[PDB]
Amino acid sequence: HHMNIYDQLQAVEDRYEELREEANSRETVAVYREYKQVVQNIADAQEMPELEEMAKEELKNSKVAKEEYEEKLRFLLLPKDPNDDKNIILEIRGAAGGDEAALFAGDLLNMYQKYAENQGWKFEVMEASANGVGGLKEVVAMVSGQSVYSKLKYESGAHRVQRVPVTESQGRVHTSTATVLVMPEVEEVEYEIDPKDLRVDIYHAKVATAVRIIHLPTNIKVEMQEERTQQKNRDKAMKIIRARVADHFAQIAQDEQDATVGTGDRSERIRTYNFPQNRVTDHRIGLTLQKLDSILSGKLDEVIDALILYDQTQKLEELN
């Protein structure tokens, strides 16, 4: 089968019309079907006094969209990370910088919360830990919807802020860091953990309802107390340990297979947010945009689509 991109996509659509792998195809067929609609629209415009000038504009517009879709299509048939279509657990922690680092963690949380709104996703904050002066020591959230990991997977790492603290009178720019970790949601079914490998402490932050679970082989610990029942706190804690433990080991297995955009090191500064310059830079793909205001407000697609494209270009080239 020495078949080209269009053959492959037509083969997908035919397999789609034959058809739980229908959802796997859904997004691709709608893109190819829309590309075929554009190609018809160009043929239509070529058949259609100032109406001639009108249709010539419509043709140019159609032709330009074909170029845009052509670029889209090449990457559609790439092999997907099977986690791409998963919901994710999101964690943000103020790291270096003090109060300013906790503020920025809050800024990031707001950004993802606004982005998640934009994307039509559900954003549950599962637990969060404030510093009692407007700052976020850490937060863990779950983000759910269509292919959430496929879009947020690149947020894992150290996010540097440079800004003049509101407390600062002398115009000095303080640099801080908040860390972000994004991990796919792992179903109990998919990743079983022997209770022998768990310590579950139940304690009062009446029935004690605060729950600490420590996965003993890794010393991964989670503490949940927000909920009114032990069961609720246990279950939340367990979703998070499962994710963290599966991620722990997926990371070692990635590391064994050395010899992906960025390093894959999650302590690496991946991004810098400079307030004075209204700048966001993503250090992995040499991208700087003077759009920090709108990025922090949740308009993060331009940045994410850049990363996706960089990765897809990488993956496509190495597939030669």
Q: Which of 271, 275, 94, 97 is nearest to 171 (CA)?
A: 275
The answer to whether 185 and 89 are in contact (CB under 8 A) is: yes
The answer to whether 84 and 265 are in contact (CB under 8 A) is: no
Return the residue matching tokens 């099977």.
82
Same domain membership, residue 289 and residue 163: yes
The answer to whether 184 and 88 are in contact (CB under 8 A) is: yes
Residue 206 maps to which CATH number? 3.30.160.20
Residue 211 forms beta bridges with which residues? 202, 224
Same domain membership, residue 174 and residue 109: yes
Q: How was this structure determined?
A: X-ray
Token readout for 57 is 């504009």
| 4: helix, strand or coil | coil
Residue 274 maps to which CATH number? 3.30.70.1660
Structural domain total, the chain:
3
Q: Which amino acid is at 162?
A: Q
Q: What angle do CA 253, 255, 259 make, to 5 degrees?
A: 120
Same domain membership, residue 198 and residue 320: no
Structural domain ending residue among the three candidates 40, 65, 83? 83
Rounded CA separation 79/61 (Å): 31
DSSP state for residue 240 in the 8-state scheme: H
Rounded CA separation 192/198 (Å): 12
Q: Which amino acid is at 242?
A: R
Same domain membership, residue 62 and residue 153: no
- Resolution, given in Å to one decimal, reads 2.3
DSSP state for residue 168 in the 8-state scheme: -
Token readout for 205 is 């932050």
Same domain membership, residue 212 and residue 109: no
Q: Which domain holds residue 77?
A: 1-83
The answer to whether 27 and 150 are in contact (CB under 8 A) is: no
Rounded CA separation 76/162 (Å): 37
